[PDB]
Assembly symmetry: D2
Homo-oligomer: 455 residues x 4
Amino acid sequence: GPSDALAALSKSTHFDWVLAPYDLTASRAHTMVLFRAGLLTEEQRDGLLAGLDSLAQDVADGSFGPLVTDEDVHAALERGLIDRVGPDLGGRLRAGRSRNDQVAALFRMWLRDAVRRVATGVLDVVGALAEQAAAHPSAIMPGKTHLQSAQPILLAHHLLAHAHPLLRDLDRIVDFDKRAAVSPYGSGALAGSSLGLDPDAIAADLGFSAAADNSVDATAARDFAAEAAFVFAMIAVDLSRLAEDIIVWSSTEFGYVTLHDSWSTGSSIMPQKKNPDIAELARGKSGRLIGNLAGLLATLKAQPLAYNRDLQEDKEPVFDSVAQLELLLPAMAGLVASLTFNVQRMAELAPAGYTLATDLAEWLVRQGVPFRSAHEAAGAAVRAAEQRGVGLQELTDDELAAISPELTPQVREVLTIEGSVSARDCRGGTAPGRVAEQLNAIGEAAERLRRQLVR
Amino acid sequence: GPSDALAALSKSTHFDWVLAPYDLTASRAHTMVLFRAGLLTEEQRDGLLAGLDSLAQDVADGSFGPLVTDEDVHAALERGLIDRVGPDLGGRLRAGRSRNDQVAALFRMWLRDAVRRVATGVLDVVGALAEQAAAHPSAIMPGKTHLQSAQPILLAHHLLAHAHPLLRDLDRIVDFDKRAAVSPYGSGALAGSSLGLDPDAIAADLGFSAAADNSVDATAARDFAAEAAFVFAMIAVDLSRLAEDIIVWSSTEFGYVTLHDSWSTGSSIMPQKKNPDIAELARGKSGRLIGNLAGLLATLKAQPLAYNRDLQEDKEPVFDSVAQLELLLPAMAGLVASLTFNVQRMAELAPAGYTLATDLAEWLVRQGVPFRSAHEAAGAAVRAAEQRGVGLQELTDDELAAISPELTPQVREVLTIEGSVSARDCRGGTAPGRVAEQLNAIGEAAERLRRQLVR
Amino acid sequence: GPSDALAALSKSTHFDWVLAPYDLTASRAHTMVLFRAGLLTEEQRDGLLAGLDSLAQDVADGSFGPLVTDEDVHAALERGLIDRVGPDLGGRLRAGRSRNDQVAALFRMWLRDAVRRVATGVLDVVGALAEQAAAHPSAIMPGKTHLQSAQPILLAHHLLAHAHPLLRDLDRIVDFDKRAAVSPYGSGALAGSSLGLDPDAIAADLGFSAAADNSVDATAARDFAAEAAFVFAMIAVDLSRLAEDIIVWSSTEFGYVTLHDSWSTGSSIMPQKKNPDIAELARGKSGRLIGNLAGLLATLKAQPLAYNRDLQEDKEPVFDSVAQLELLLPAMAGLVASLTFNVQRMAELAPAGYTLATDLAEWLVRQGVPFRSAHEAAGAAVRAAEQRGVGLQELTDDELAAISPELTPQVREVLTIEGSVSARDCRGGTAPGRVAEQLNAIGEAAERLRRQLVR
Amino acid sequence: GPSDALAALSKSTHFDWVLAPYDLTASRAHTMVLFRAGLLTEEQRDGLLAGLDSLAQDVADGSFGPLVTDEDVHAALERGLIDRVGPDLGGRLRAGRSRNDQVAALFRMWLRDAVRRVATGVLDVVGALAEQAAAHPSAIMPGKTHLQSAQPILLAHHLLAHAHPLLRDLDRIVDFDKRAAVSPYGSGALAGSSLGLDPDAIAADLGFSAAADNSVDATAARDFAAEAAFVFAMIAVDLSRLAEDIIVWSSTEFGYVTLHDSWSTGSSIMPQKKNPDIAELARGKSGRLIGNLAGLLATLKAQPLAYNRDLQEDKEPVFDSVAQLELLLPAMAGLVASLTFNVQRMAELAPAGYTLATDLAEWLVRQGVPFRSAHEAAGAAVRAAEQRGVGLQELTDDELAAISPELTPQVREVLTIEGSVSARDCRGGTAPGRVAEQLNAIGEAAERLRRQLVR
């Protein structure tokens, strides 16, 4: 038999046990296949189905599990079934079975459930962002580029900017599932079943949308796994951007947010210090999921057709990525929802460094003023204001008129932070009216995606 | 100004010159924005458009190019426009423009063209595979698993198993393009234009399907780039599988194919010796493109909002992945199309090592024979035929009966390679009838995907 | 208290239990630190050390394990220690302890043991290659370039070509360990201990070679972990090259090797067919380990100083790469040792396709013949022999002289594979004499590395 | 002849031209090899060297360059040589020459120069960190963990914490070089030369430390390139950490540093705003270089021996990584050197949030106080101070005694930031006396490493 080293290397039960319910489902399906093929009596069919039901119970309550001598989840469950119905009846399921189309089938069935648990977690983070945005619809903050202050924006606009990538990831999940929903069952070892079974019927029975077009491709290809790994990596990277904002916002130097005691760690002695651990772990684990993706693609690279044992490595990186997101998504959702925003802090910084001189120039350009001239006017305003040690808004009607006759008192409309943001009122802009329309569209987009994922 | 070290680091003209036509298109669109805003006269507008067409022609024929002092393609083209219409009229274009929404828009426009040049190449490889499959409808070869002979399959079936993944890649391009087709123009530096422009109209004019929902996300996010890099990596990996097959097929030990003089390297000395360099470069370059993807995700990880100079690193790995595929796809297409298949060699190998013993057992199982018993029967036939040193087909009826009474002479239906493949006649199977249907659907699917990419 | 989602995300006991013995060692060392600091009596010291000995024994035999409520291995062992010596004495260990320098220390300690287990496995694969080379000192095979036959080479030369990379990997482990062998203990949370302890003393105690130069870098940096991940990935890639050769050699088309029943998979039916699963799993897992490395660098990227929670992600990729290599190296070693080389098959193929014409041409060059003429002479020789349907060796003295007067009957020195390989007698060449020296030197180099890796 | 698609794919002159001087050097070396072998007269020899000298001049001044029809740098220089000495004398150099050992040799030669250009740049960054640390010996800042304030540390300690990883990288370069300095010249196509040349002599001639042990390994393996990719990635990741700090330090919220106008970008409008573009590009390109490494390992994975065209792909990712670092290192050195540290700001922040209560508790523990007693005492002192709205040092002797008899007035020696950091006086700690020793040791280590890289 196999050497100890071979058996230890090829054993998959430490990770594949999560496929057990799907294996049992496939076995139930296969019992029907054999019945339709006249290869099982009704007595045998019913006996096999009873045994499988009993096995499913024992797997579910943990009274049945793998032994060290089981190579994989399928072998464990075959042993379990034989223990329950005897070797004669139990062994009858081996007819018309293959191990290559089965393993591909189970991974897809698992993945289509997995991607929807992830999707539900993503919708929860989108929900938490939308909820904070609706709760703070008028808070103004500095808009950052290069982590430096540029144009004032609504906090709500910044928060929702983290929802749109996740909505795109949900869209990626929907697109992915169509590809995932093709059944390889009936493709056999590589060349197609010779049993005369019906791939289309089996596919429907197992919850797939269709059966495969080419048995060799159905059993050999794993681009569905690579794609899922990419979507999971993308989601993780998108969380890491949100995470980076929160980590920086949380610093006492920024002080934009206060973390909740239950969604952070804290000091034994320093009373008010809280650490953004959840965000940090999101940040760190995004690198992990990138690695899972890169490594799976390298595993798939230069595979000759058809099935090779390399392909056993398809599952663990994807299993890992899903398990990480299942932990990260509820943790990030709660972190976001429990944030306290320090609105005076953010608003105070928003007009600093004469950033509103940009708005002044843009206003001038809108009046028909040449851009260079506008710029010069803005510079004059900045220098004039700096001399008196006041903000631009505190410049007198005479001082403004002095700099340029185009600088009418009406320019003060964009020399407040409210006035600044309100002027940015095109689609996608940070003006309150647009952000309100953006927020409603997010609610509808999310609901539409959610319903697309209903099977 | 900038130190030499800073200027050298941030200079992008060595790769961004391919954006020049898109930058000119954007500038034409912005001339219209400004005219709609009443910020340009009809004379000024016509002067700018005419000057842009002068500059465009001088870019197209290489008259106009960047200088060492130019930092980026936009600055170069602004210099060019100013040379052509004077600084007074030229400078008027600066009104209402931002860099950050512009650079995101240009990359998307370039990418929607690039992904279509890639798609055309992909369709050519699919076509070369279809071409070789159609030319050899009845040739049978060994079906490999673990690079060991299993069930005989049609050569066409194997070839087409490399076409289905590519069709899926095409499907991925179609899905990606919908996300790519969203315009950031009008989002400004991050907060949205204050000019009063119409992002939906600018979008239409630039060839986008829609404008962005959030100015911060539109200027900061680059998941569209990561998704393109994933699709390119996946295409490359799929080519590396086809490449690996051809390299093994080409070895003198296999001798499944003879390479074409014009699509391989060889020596004058030994005329028959040909090397599959194109397939080897495909294999090697798939690694490169996995790297581009992994690296781009790592670049995007933990970016705080909004625009950071980090994001300048979005283009070069995607430009690299596209340029590589643009070399690889016609190379692989021609390599595949010009192959000589040695069908007698492949047919002779297909039934080696009594592989048809599997078909024998499967036949017995179809007859109602228990699996264990069928396998015993299969073992017996191999031994029985091995003892006489003949193929299984050559066993007499009496002998076949001796091994088992269930083994009627009818079992001979599957004891030739033609009868073996013929029995695998479910959807996706290698039977000539299914394969012809498969091949028909591939041509239709390819064309449907092609129409979906017409803009 | 922590939310359920926070507790679930931050819990590390599902992977960090392997650190338990190292944690206990650290506790013993810290008992000595506290006693030196005059903070423990001799009784308190002996009491603690006795409790830690109790705890170690219970950990070692499985009677003590983590609970669901334990966040990490250190908390579990603190619980266990208090259970054994009561809270009053057990709580006294907490004095002068910090988490961050400890977790860094433990990982390093574990990694220096782990890398030596990996090194022993690498030496076993090297030994198995050397042993197969020693058993077949004169077997000649085709030398492959592009998977095409080029110069004949000794099978031993090919086999040893897979040992040199692994020796380089061992050399990388030695170089890595000097960096690994620096203790962070006493660096505290980040700024260094204020207890007045002696990091150099503690370092020696814990098995390190030196103590760190900077408390901030000692607690924050993880480049030692990235470097280990690289070396493990390099080892995996080197194994994948060997794997690829064995997979191809194993094909029935090559028939260079026959697999062993205990080191392959197969079927009872066709006893002869065997699959190289071990090599295929090695190929697949190399992708996985490349992923682990890429992801870990992505995790370490753009970390601000000092410790961040992101750093918790340092272990799992490295643990996974080590666990995989500890399965792979004995499997590959046993796979190599079990191979049966079909030397007659390889010898028959070595001179095919008139490859010895190259040797002919080169011999002419050695005689002073101009390059291009030497080549047409060789091409002439081939076609002359092509005509007669014989080998270059069978060309009569007249035919040789006919082709060229320089082609004396002595040329036949290189027109046998034996004479061909014998001419390649410079350092590193495939001549029997050179390879025997190469093989002797490999044993010496392996022994030198082995010794460097014992402490 | 080769199709256009084949020629376009295999062409390498767009990146390989940097190998021109190394190729010329090898050609001189080979001219000697042939002379020693008596295959060149002195007239032919001196005629060749004269031609190669002319060619070297023309290459160095741009007068000679590749044509579109040249496949590679070697073919171009060969063409150029024939132009200068005529096809007869020129064509004699091809005797005893192989492509496979040559391309591995030139890459190695290039790489050993390149890694030293990189090392010098790394030493420049180390130098800039060290000079800033020397310039600011008494500045105390918040020590960060989780980007939250913990123990106070010297600014010099923090800055030097970015030097040590770089020193480790320099050490990695030294170790890598030993593996790099092995010559493949003489290994021929794969089996070793039959010319009788002397590999040890050629190696020493070309600047290598030794010649290879196995011709197959010397021509096929590329782990040396993988290792360089790793060292370059690790350097980039280490710069990305320094970069992140600078970016965050530069935010107006932190205000720890002010960037220099020549080493940052500014705003035409906001007079004081400066963006950390150099740091941001360093962060972004670190992702790029991780990708290069991952991709190269993926390229090397599962290569059968020996040379395969795959291996052409070895150069561009390494070339790219070097080219990026050669831009980044002087940019980051000058960035660091020109920073202005705002020392009042950092000092004001360092003792915030009652962080010195940790120091309080630790001081108690040093006085034999039970760990829990120390911690609730410190917590009490915080509460006491917090209600008087004062700092811990402002507690009276009587209030301290109230909280605990152990809190004698001497506890005040750690209730200033200077006294806090002064207490951390073990090796590697942030006390001024330790940091001074650390800083001196960095100077010695830097110089030692530089000497080791001198060839």
